[PDB]
Design a binder for this molecule. Structure first.
Ligand SMILES: [Ca+2]
Ligand SMILES: [Ca+2]
Ligand SMILES: [Ca+2]
Ligand SMILES: [Ca+2]
Length: 151
Protein backbone atom coordinates (compact mmCIF):
# COMPACT_ATOMS: atom_id res chain seq x y z
CA UNK A 1 0.00 0.00 0.00
CA UNK A 2 1.21 3.60 -0.09
CA UNK A 3 3.76 3.66 2.69
CA UNK A 4 4.12 6.61 5.06
CA UNK A 5 7.63 7.72 4.86
CA UNK A 6 9.25 8.53 8.11
CA UNK A 7 6.90 6.53 10.31
CA UNK A 8 9.03 3.53 11.09
CA UNK A 9 7.30 2.55 14.37
CA UNK A 10 3.93 2.32 12.68
CA UNK A 11 1.94 4.64 14.95
CA UNK A 12 1.12 6.94 12.07
CA UNK A 13 3.06 10.01 13.22
CA UNK A 14 6.62 11.18 12.60
CA UNK A 15 8.39 10.96 15.91
CA UNK A 16 11.74 10.33 17.66
CA UNK A 17 10.72 6.67 18.14
CA UNK A 18 10.96 6.15 14.39
CA UNK A 19 14.53 7.43 14.31
CA UNK A 20 15.55 4.95 17.03
CA UNK A 21 14.32 1.99 14.96
CA UNK A 22 15.74 3.38 11.70
CA UNK A 23 19.12 3.80 13.43
CA UNK A 24 19.20 0.18 14.51
CA UNK A 25 18.70 -1.09 10.89
CA UNK A 26 21.62 0.93 9.78
CA UNK A 27 23.76 -0.08 12.72
CA UNK A 28 22.77 -3.83 12.95
CA UNK A 29 19.18 -5.13 12.43
CA UNK A 30 16.74 -5.92 9.69
CA UNK A 31 13.10 -4.95 9.64
CA UNK A 32 10.11 -5.83 7.52
CA UNK A 33 10.28 -4.69 3.92
CA UNK A 34 7.32 -2.39 4.71
CA UNK A 35 9.51 -0.66 7.34
CA UNK A 36 12.28 -0.55 4.77
CA UNK A 37 10.07 1.34 2.36
CA UNK A 38 9.12 3.78 5.15
CA UNK A 39 12.78 4.13 5.99
CA UNK A 40 13.68 5.33 2.55
CA UNK A 41 12.97 8.97 2.92
CA UNK A 42 15.03 10.39 0.02
CA UNK A 43 13.39 7.96 -2.39
CA UNK A 44 16.55 6.36 -3.87
CA UNK A 45 15.21 3.03 -2.71
CA UNK A 46 18.07 2.28 -0.35
CA UNK A 47 18.03 2.86 3.31
CA UNK A 48 21.11 4.96 3.66
CA UNK A 49 22.54 6.53 6.77
CA UNK A 50 21.56 9.73 4.94
CA UNK A 51 17.90 8.70 5.48
CA UNK A 52 18.27 8.69 9.28
CA UNK A 53 20.03 12.01 9.04
CA UNK A 54 17.24 13.63 7.04
CA UNK A 55 14.69 12.09 9.45
CA UNK A 56 16.76 13.58 12.27
CA UNK A 57 16.83 16.92 10.39
CA UNK A 58 13.04 16.76 10.15
CA UNK A 59 12.75 15.95 13.88
CA UNK A 60 15.30 18.64 14.89
CA UNK A 61 13.72 21.21 12.58
CA UNK A 62 16.70 21.66 10.26
CA UNK A 63 14.81 20.53 7.23
CA UNK A 64 13.60 17.16 6.15
CA UNK A 65 13.04 17.87 2.49
CA UNK A 66 12.40 14.20 1.65
CA UNK A 67 9.04 12.23 1.54
CA UNK A 68 8.85 12.39 5.35
CA UNK A 69 5.22 12.67 6.35
CA UNK A 70 4.06 11.82 2.87
CA UNK A 71 3.01 8.54 1.41
CA UNK A 72 5.26 6.74 -0.92
CA UNK A 73 3.08 5.76 -3.69
CA UNK A 74 5.03 3.29 -5.55
CA UNK A 75 3.59 1.59 -8.48
CA UNK A 76 2.53 -1.80 -7.06
CA UNK A 77 4.72 -4.46 -8.65
CA UNK A 78 7.00 -1.85 -10.10
CA UNK A 79 10.30 -2.07 -8.32
CA UNK A 80 12.17 0.51 -10.30
CA UNK A 81 9.08 2.71 -9.76
CA UNK A 82 8.83 4.33 -13.14
CA UNK A 83 5.06 4.04 -13.21
CA UNK A 84 4.93 0.83 -15.20
CA UNK A 85 4.93 -2.72 -13.93
CA UNK A 86 7.08 -3.93 -16.71
CA UNK A 87 9.21 -6.89 -17.59
CA UNK A 88 12.35 -5.40 -16.05
CA UNK A 89 10.59 -5.33 -12.68
CA UNK A 90 9.84 -8.98 -13.24
CA UNK A 91 13.59 -9.50 -13.94
CA UNK A 92 14.48 -7.86 -10.56
CA UNK A 93 12.28 -10.29 -8.53
CA UNK A 94 13.86 -13.24 -10.31
CA UNK A 95 17.33 -11.64 -9.63
CA UNK A 96 16.62 -11.81 -5.89
CA UNK A 97 15.43 -15.41 -6.24
CA UNK A 98 18.54 -16.39 -8.19
CA UNK A 99 20.75 -14.27 -5.95
CA UNK A 100 22.30 -12.53 -8.89
CA UNK A 101 20.97 -9.08 -8.24
CA UNK A 102 20.12 -7.10 -5.24
CA UNK A 103 17.18 -4.90 -4.87
CA UNK A 104 17.29 -1.95 -2.61
CA UNK A 105 15.38 -1.86 0.77
CA UNK A 106 12.29 0.07 -0.36
CA UNK A 107 12.36 -1.80 -3.64
CA UNK A 108 12.16 -5.03 -1.66
CA UNK A 109 8.71 -3.97 -0.48
CA UNK A 110 7.81 -2.55 -3.95
CA UNK A 111 8.52 -5.98 -5.39
CA UNK A 112 6.56 -7.70 -2.68
CA UNK A 113 3.36 -8.30 -4.53
CA UNK A 114 1.78 -10.55 -1.93
CA UNK A 115 2.56 -8.32 1.03
CA UNK A 116 4.35 -10.94 3.24
CA UNK A 117 7.51 -8.71 3.30
CA UNK A 118 9.62 -11.40 1.66
CA UNK A 119 10.67 -11.56 -1.97
CA UNK A 120 9.73 -15.05 -2.60
CA UNK A 121 8.90 -16.99 -5.70
CA UNK A 122 5.17 -16.25 -5.36
CA UNK A 123 5.77 -12.49 -6.07
CA UNK A 124 7.48 -13.48 -9.30
CA UNK A 125 4.38 -15.47 -10.33
CA UNK A 126 1.99 -12.68 -9.22
CA UNK A 127 3.84 -10.31 -11.49
CA UNK A 128 3.57 -13.00 -14.26
CA UNK A 129 -0.18 -12.83 -13.85
CA UNK A 130 -0.33 -9.03 -13.46
CA UNK A 131 1.71 -8.34 -16.65
CA UNK A 132 -0.47 -10.77 -18.62
CA UNK A 133 -3.68 -9.25 -17.17
CA UNK A 134 -4.68 -12.46 -15.38
CA UNK A 135 -4.97 -10.62 -12.11
CA UNK A 136 -6.03 -7.03 -11.97
CA UNK A 137 -5.13 -6.78 -8.33
CA UNK A 138 -2.07 -7.65 -6.43
CA UNK A 139 -2.49 -8.37 -2.68
CA UNK A 140 -0.23 -5.29 -2.12
CA UNK A 141 -2.49 -3.08 -4.36
CA UNK A 142 -2.79 -2.27 -8.07
CA UNK A 143 -2.19 0.52 -10.53
CA UNK A 144 -4.59 -0.53 -13.26
CA UNK A 145 -7.14 1.55 -11.50
CA UNK A 146 -5.78 5.09 -12.00
CA UNK A 147 -8.63 7.02 -10.23
CA UNK A 148 -8.56 9.55 -13.00
CA UNK A 149 -9.00 7.17 -15.90
CA UNK A 150 -10.49 4.25 -13.98
CA UNK A 151 -10.90 2.46 -17.22
CA1 LIG B 1 6.19 7.08 14.62
CA1 LIG C 1 17.32 6.54 0.90
CA1 LIG D 1 9.22 -0.65 -13.81
CA1 LIG E 1 6.22 -12.04 -1.19
Amino acid sequence: MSVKIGDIDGNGEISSIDYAILKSHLINSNLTFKQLAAADVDGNGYVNSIDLAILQMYLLGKGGTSDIGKNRIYTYGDIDNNGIVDENDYILICNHINGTGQLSDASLFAADADGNNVIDQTDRILIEKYITGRITHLPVGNQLEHHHHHH
